[PDB]
Design a protein around this ligand. Sequence first.
Ligand SMILES: *[C@@]12=NC3=[C]C([C])=C([C])[C]=C3N([C][C]([O])[C]([O])[C]([O])[C]OP([O])([O])=O)C1=NC(=O)[N]C2=O
Length: 108
Amino acid sequence: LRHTFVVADATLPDCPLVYASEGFYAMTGYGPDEVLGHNCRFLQGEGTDPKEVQKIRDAIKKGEACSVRLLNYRKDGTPFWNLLTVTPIKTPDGRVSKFVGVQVDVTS
Ligand SMILES: *[C@@]12=NC3=[C]C([C])=C([C])[C]=C3N([C][C]([O])[C]([O])[C]([O])[C]OP([O])([O])=O)C1=NC(=O)[N]C2=O
């Protein structure tokens, strides 16, 4: 199946994205200059369910994995359904260093 992949830096307080696969840029319409250094939430918009957003916010704050389905918007404004799985990456001392995300466009 077609998916995309990003890495977020958890050592920075607001989990900016530091790496994205070619598919992530191609799927969203945004280039590296608009994606790198930014929190993934710029993909959100009017129809995004705040309850699902809250699930990821809590899991990130708690350093747990999380899988949620979100309405997202491309650079051109058009919406798509993003099945998103975030995974915490810990150092051996228990601290979370990075979050990794798999994003699937599940508009089908
Ligand atoms: C986004 N993918 C994504 C990938 C990773 C690795 C992480 C850590 C987060 C995301 N987000 C969410 C965003 O960064 C944030 O966690 C949430 O919006 C909730 O926190 P706030 O503070 O905003 O309430 C992704 N969000 C998207 O909308 N699309 C993704 O692809």
